[PDB]
Write a protein that binds this DNA or RNA. Structure first.
Lengths: 12, 12
RNA sequence: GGAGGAGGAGGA
RNA sequence: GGAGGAGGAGGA
């Protein structure tokens, strides 16, 4: 139950 | 047991 | 560090 | 959402 489940939208 | 233990130096 | 999504700028 | 501290920009 976190952020976007390693599907990083801009890869950081 | 968190970040800066709300002695907040950067306001956030 | 997955117990929260308050948040994308850390990556687990 | 306090147990990670990889991070400081949420702030509870």
């Amino acid at each position: 139950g976190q952020w976007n489940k390693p599907s990083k939208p801009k890869t950081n």
